Each structure stands twice: as C-alpha cells, then as structure tokens.
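Ticket opened by: R.M.
Priority: normal
Category: complex prediction / small molecule

The reporter submitted a protein together with manganese (II) ion and asked that the result be attached to this ticket for the collaborator who will pick it up next week. Submitted input follows.
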Amino acid sequence: SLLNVPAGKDLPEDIYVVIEIPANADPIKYEIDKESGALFVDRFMSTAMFYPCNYGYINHTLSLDGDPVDVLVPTPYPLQPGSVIRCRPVGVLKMTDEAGEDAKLVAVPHSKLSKEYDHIKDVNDLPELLKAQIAHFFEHYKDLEKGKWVKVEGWENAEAAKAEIVASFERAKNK
Amino acid sequence: SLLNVPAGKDLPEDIYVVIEIPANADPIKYEIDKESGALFVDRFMSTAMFYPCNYGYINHTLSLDGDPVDVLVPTPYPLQPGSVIRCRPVGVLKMTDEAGEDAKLVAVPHSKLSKEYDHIKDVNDLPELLKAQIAHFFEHYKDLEKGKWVKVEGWENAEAAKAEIVASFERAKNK
Amino acid sequence: SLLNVPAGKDLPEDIYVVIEIPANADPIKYEIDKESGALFVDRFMSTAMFYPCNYGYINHTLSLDGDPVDVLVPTPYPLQPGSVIRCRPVGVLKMTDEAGEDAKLVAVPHSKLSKEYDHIKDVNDLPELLKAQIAHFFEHYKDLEKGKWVKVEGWENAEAAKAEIVASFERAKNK
Amino acid sequence: SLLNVPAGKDLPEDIYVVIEIPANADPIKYEIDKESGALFVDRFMSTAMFYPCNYGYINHTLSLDGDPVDVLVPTPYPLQPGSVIRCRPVGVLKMTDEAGEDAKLVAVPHSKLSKEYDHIKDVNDLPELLKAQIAHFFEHYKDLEKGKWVKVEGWENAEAAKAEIVASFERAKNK
Amino acid sequence: SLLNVPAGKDLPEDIYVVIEIPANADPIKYEIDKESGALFVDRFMSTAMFYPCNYGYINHTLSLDGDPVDVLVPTPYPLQPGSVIRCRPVGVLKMTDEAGEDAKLVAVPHSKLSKEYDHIKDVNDLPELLKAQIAHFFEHYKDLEKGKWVKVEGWENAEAAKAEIVASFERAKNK
Amino acid sequence: SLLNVPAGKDLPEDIYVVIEIPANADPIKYEIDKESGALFVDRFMSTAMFYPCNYGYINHTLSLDGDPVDVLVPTPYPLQPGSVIRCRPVGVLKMTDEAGEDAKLVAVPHSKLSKEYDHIKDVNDLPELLKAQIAHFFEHYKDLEKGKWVKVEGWENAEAAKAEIVASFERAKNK
Ligand SMILES: [Mn+2]
Ligand SMILES: [Mn+2]
Ligand SMILES: [Mn+2]
Ligand SMILES: [Mn+2]
Ligand SMILES: [Mn+2]
Ligand SMILES: [Mn+2]
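Result attached by the on-call engineer:
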C-alpha cells in the first residue's frame, strides 16, 4: 500500500510524491491517515479558493511540523488522489504557520514521465505567475479559519529544497 | 487500509463513514469488497437517476441486512470514493427492501471538518427538499431492476439513528 | 437576444439576471459585450480563487460604476453562461473599488423556479458561511492585479438592494 | 440567431433540433425564450434525476401543447445548450401531461454528422434499455412537483413521428 | 450578435477570435452558422482525439479555403463556445487539406487579458511539445473519415501569420 | 488490497479487471505498482488523444510482454481508477510493440452488473466504429514518444481471447 511507498529512487533528486489533493479541485482538504493508508477528509475549506498545483507528501520523511515534507507538483492534467508521482525537487516556499516552519517544496514531474519540465531546474525557472499564485494561496486559504495564521516568508532554491529532503528523511529514519 | 478504519472516535455520535459513491455522480453503484478492501463495481444503474448525497458505510458494523450500516452524507462538494469522512448521525430513513430492514442513516460532516452543518442536529433540521429527494431516490432507483422492490416507510430521529449504530456495532463485535 | 432581455417582470422584487460567470468555474472573467450581445473574455484571473456563486447583471440598469447592477445568484447547480435567471433581491455587498461604489447584490432564484430559497428573504437569512466567502472573494480576487484595489465595506438588507434596482433602472431609462 | 433556424433541410426526415438541455447534465430545465432567443432557466428539478439524452425542439413547429415539438437526441458526447443538431426522426413517446398530448420524438444524429446511428431507422432499432430509461424519466421527473402529472402511454414508430413533424410544421405556418 | 463581432481592434496584431471549440473537450466539431450566428454540430469525430487548444475563427475574413481564418488559442483554462477572445497572432501551421491551403494560425491571449503569454512573440517561443501536439492532431484527426486527407507542411512565423490576416481581411472586404 | 484480487470467478469467461485508466480521461497513463498496490503515474502522454474505453489488467496473469493481460472495457459511464470490474472477454487486438506480442483484450461488463452488453458475444458484435477507434488509438498514442513503435496486426475472436487468459494465468501460477 501507500505506507510502503519509497521516499524516492535516489534521494534527494529522484523522489516519490504521494498525491492527496489534485490541481484545480473543489476546496476539500484530504490527507492520508498514516495509521491505515486511507484518504481522510481533513476539512472542507470555507474560502472560495482551490489548490493551484497537486499537493502531497514524500513518505518516510519528517519535517519540522510533525508530518512528512509537503510537496506541490505542477502537471499538465490533474492527478488522482492516492496516486504516486516521480518528481525532481526544484524549490521551496518558506512559511511559518501554527506548527512553525511548514515549508512546501515545489517538485516537477521527472524526465521519465514527461519532457515538459526539463528546462525547469531551480526556482527562477518556474513561471513568475505560478510562484505568486501558490504564495497567495498559502497566504490566504485559512483566512476564514479561526485559530489559523501563516507568515509566508519567501522562496528558496533547489538545494535549499534538497537539504530539507535529506534532513527530513534522516530525521525519520532515526526513529 | 480501509478494512482497518475504526467505526468512529466516539460511538455513536462521532463515527467514520467510508464513502463508496460520491454525490452527483453517474449512475454506477460501487461497494468495498470486504475481502480485499478494493472498490468493486456492483452494477450500472439503468435508471436516469443519481445519488443525491455521498453514500457509504460505517465499518465494523452489521445491520439487519447483512452489511454495515449504510450512511448518506450531504457535503458542500462531492467526496472521493474510498475516502473516509468524520460525521455525526442526525436521522434515518426506514425502508424494507428484499433484505428486509435496510435503513439508511443520514450523517453530516462533524464540527471539526466544517462549521456548516452545526445547526442540523436532528431530522427536522435537514431541509425538507433534501429529505424528499433521498426518499424519492430510494423509492425509485431500482425500478428498472427486475427482482428489486422497496417500501420506503418514513424518517426517524437522531437517537433512532444512534441506537442502530450501537446495535449494529455490538452485533458485529460478538462474532 | 440578450440585449432585449427585460430588467424583470416586476421591479424591483421580480428581476431577470443575465449570467456571465457560473458558480465554481475556472478563474475566467466573462462579460457580455453591450455592443453585440456576445460573451467576451475580460481577463484570466491570476489568483487561485473561483466565483462562489453565479455572477451576472440586471439588463437596462446603470449603477454608479458605469455598468448594469452586478448580481450574485446562489443556485443548487451551476447555470450556463448567457442564460437568464428569474430572481428576487435579498441583500447587497457594499464595496468601493477603482470605479467607486460598485455594489454587488445577492439575489436568489424566484419561487417559481424552485422552492428552496423561499425562507431567505433578507441578508440575515443567507447562511453566515456564504456571506464571508463572497466578502472574502471580493476582498481578494484582484490581489495579483496591479492597479486594482477594493474596500469591502459591509452587507446591506433587501430594501437597500431594492432601492439600488429602481435607482439604477431609472438612471438608465433617462438616457 | 436561434429564432431564425430552419425547421430542417428536408422535412420531415432531415430536421434541425435546437438543444436546450444536454445529456447527463445537472437537473436544471432550460428553455429558449421565443421572444429574445435567450436560454432561460425554467426551474431547478427537485428530483435526483437527469436527462437521459439531449433535449430540445424543432423550430417553426407548434405541437398540441402550445410549444414546438420536443425532441430527445441520443449522441456520443453531450452537446451544448443553444447549439443546433441535424437529425433524422426515428420514433415518438406518447404521453399526456397537464398540457394534454405532449409527445417527445426521439431523433438521431443525421448520417452526415456521424455514421454511428445509421442502423437505427425506427423505434425497434433503439436499444431496449434506452427506451425504458427515457420512459421512466418522463414518468417520474415531476414527482416532487405539486400540480404536475404525466400518463406515459407508449412508444410510436418513425412515420408516427414524421406525421407529427408535418402537422406541427403546417399548424405553425398557418399563423 | 456573433456576426457583428469586429475582426480585431487593430489588425493584424490585435484581433478577436470567436471560439467554436474549447480546449480539452469531447470530440465534437462545432461551427458558427454564418447565416444565423448559431453554433451547429458539424460532426462527431470518430477518433479518440481532442482539440489541444481552443479553436475558432477571425470574423470578417476569408482565407483560401472559403471560410474565415482558423485560429488555435492556447489558454490557462478552457473557454466557452460562442465566447470571443482578444488575441495577438504568433505563428501559423501550413497545411493543405481537401480545400487546399487551410492554414491554422496560433494566437495567444492579448496582454490586457493575462500577462502569461507576453514572452511568446513568435513560433520559436511556443513550447516544442505544444507545436508537435497540434501538428499531430491536424495530421490525424480525420483518419477515420473517408474522403478526408491532410498534408501538414510546417510551421511559419508571426508576420507570415499577420500577412494571412490582412490578405484574408482584405479579400472579404472587397465583396 | 488490489494485489489480492482474484483473476476471476470462473476463468476464462468470468474474470475481474482492475481499472487503471478510465474512459475519456485526460492523457495520463497510470499503472498499479505490483510491489505496493499503489496507482503510479507512468507518463503524461504528449499526444492529444484519450483512452476510448477503460483500461486495466487481469491480476495473477502474465502475458508475453512481462505484465498481466491488458484489458479494455467499454462501459456506460467511466469507472474509477483502482476499482475492479466483473467482465466477460469478447475479443483481442493483436499488436506487437517494443515488448513483442502485447495483445489487448476487449472485455464487456458481465451480465450481473448490467444487461446492456448481453448481445455482444464475440468481436463481430462490437460496433465497427469502436473497433477502429481503439485500433487507431493503439496505432498512434506513442507517436510523439521516441523509442516507441507499434504494429497493430488485427482483431481476434472471443476464444482467441479466452486462450490468452488461461495461458497467461497458467504461466503466472507456475512461478
Ligand atoms: Mn507541513
Ligand atoms: Mn443495507
Ligand atoms: Mn459594478
Ligand atoms: Mn410538449
Ligand atoms: Mn480553413
Ligand atoms: Mn502488454
């Protein structure tokens, strides 16, 4: 099952991302329950906003917040929830929320699944319009959620992203 | 997996519902196969009707028909098949089909996932239009199915629903 | 055509609303071109937000901004662009944008098309969750649009809405 | 515009059908307003049923009910509302509703738009499953509509359908 | 209506394109009937292919085939059929079909509707993957259509495209 | 889970097919990872083509290519990825790709799930239009994939299909 999915083929540049929320989907936040591997509704968002890119996580990783690293994956057509994608990390969006540092990496479909994101290698390569849409999403999606706040610092490059993969991976391996 | 999902956090007012059929979906009846945890097509409905609310079941329960209690869950946007929702039972639709009493509870998204169904506490609280649409669905969806009939008695309140949760839960626990 | 659609059957409580943008649709802003009656793309929104309710206008009206009164219409299922709906005004969201007062009334499907919004008669009747979602939409949809700003004052009642219908209607009739 | 669309190229076997409601669409009944050519919402259906085939009418025809002949058009993929289709009548579903005889012909995409319905030439040719689904739809869609009833007589053949085209066409031509 | 839509604001670099077929839509070919302004089904495609970009035409133009120039418009989200888009021509795909030269220009959303295609100025700017997908579509969509053939020559630049706009525009103006 | 799904109830005429790719879905190729049971993205197709029928495989089978037999299943409405369908084999499309014989059987929904494909018993029974669409799909979907080729031989009957089920089933059982 989905709890036995590797972290990636060659960390940290060839990783697997488990999708929990597809791109352009109704405002429903899903999460895989680490206990059973089941997709669970987390909450219905009250805001009239949608995820700009597919959202998921890298399994067998533990970032600073408590949970696996959170990955946003732009794709040509929306992926299915529970499906796994083979990506390459290209950047990270630093933000501090309740949980404290809660970074969101941005990873693009690996070269073997599609030749379309091969020119994107680092955060300056992603379109400017897509960086501001994600940034704006994260600054406002929990605006109608009392007890939820988020300081969206800024963007960070591919090895800032790749360092968070090893660290989070190593942090989980050591119990 | 989905066969290890609890019945709920605090039975019978805080239960988990495994969704098998989303709201407003094409007429395809799905069911989780209790043997593997796989979603299986049960039948294509011949009628030009669709489920009015998300439909699923409470795991580790055995009602009178043979199967887990059947739950209908109204939500803002359709959920995914195989996903689990955290609900609060509010009523039950009594009906006798081939299998005999085959009640369908109506449960709404728990307070922690959305603040929108907090005013709904019992069956008089659900909109009148939605009770008649469900009722009408259940009276006519297997009309073009030879060997299928259904007497849709009436509606019952939240502790009529909550009694069917304990009873069905207890009935399954005792082998 | 759509340029010959009446303002309503009995102004201001029985009005027609021409839909330009459906509920829960991709972020594309459409507008009927007053010159030909054609639906024209106005802009692609850069934000990851969607209209919370169907959006359109009352024809043969001129509000303060230059254009017909802007109406938001909640419905059970999204309407088509270019289609006309028979509504009853119930409230207004006051906001000042570039254009100055740019109010947005909220009107619900008339009793003859559906019995579901009959209990809603004024702005206190609309669900609290839907008022804050619209309010929040209007406060942030043009956030990634340089040269666009919006002060979302507050909500106003059904005869505040009904006064803006007559005034805007009278303002257009007098050349 | 849509009020200037011919009845057909060669009545009654080569006719045009103006689509008002697509196949497999949410329960919203649309109608072209004969006065402006605008698509207008007629009502939101309360029942959890959807049109089984595209529904529309033949322009410049007047059947017994008051309105143009009503045509159901099965197609591979749902058509757009306001679009016109080139069909060939193959049968008719006799029913008496409030309005009295309110027949619904069934017409299939003409040979020039697709080679797929060429074997269907009369009502015995249409699949049995699709005749019963339409029949069942018409017997129950206005079940939750007080003041609406419908006796669905039976099915009739292609020249029963073709006679209703000429008669309705002639009945409209003579003022 | 749609038969009164200008050719563009400033030919040939600021043109209007009437959309007939949206991006990523079921295989149904639509066309505006020059006689009424109605969208008409032209044919159901038998192939399992879909338009890669929105397809439409520039009104008040006559290319070599008989019809207005044919334009493909890439956009972030699919547009509606019958809607008009404000574009800027960037290239052309030369092909000879039954009709002889039947070029297809590629035009992108004007700067005023979205800042996203501002870097694209000529055919070398469009992604390589999208040129080959369109090219491949046009080489194979009428493969299961007996009596239909197409030699897809190659791609041509923005002033090759802009010359076809003036020529086609001038060719229509002179009766 | 999905790795424990039987091959069928009564091989080879009553088999189970695990769906990986639904009908009429965006061009994303999915595959169940035999190691975890997770749906994995295989590749984004570059071509503007979509699967004509639901695609999946028969578990606990090994054809000549290395993988389980590949099955195409026509259905009234698209199925979900990861769901299992109960079918009856009716034919096979012989083709040699990189992997060598890579046959694709065509199986239709079993009589117990729907009465609609009961007349289809062998490959001459399937509509001609659907055989050519599948055939055409398989001849061109990897056209923009360098290192991918496919000779689509022809069609074969129900016991040619049924022999490939036993053989592939027996070939997997013997380690
Ligand atoms: Mn986090
Ligand atoms: Mn039951
Ligand atoms: Mn305004
Ligand atoms: Mn009628
Ligand atoms: Mn042409
Ligand atoms: Mn194979």
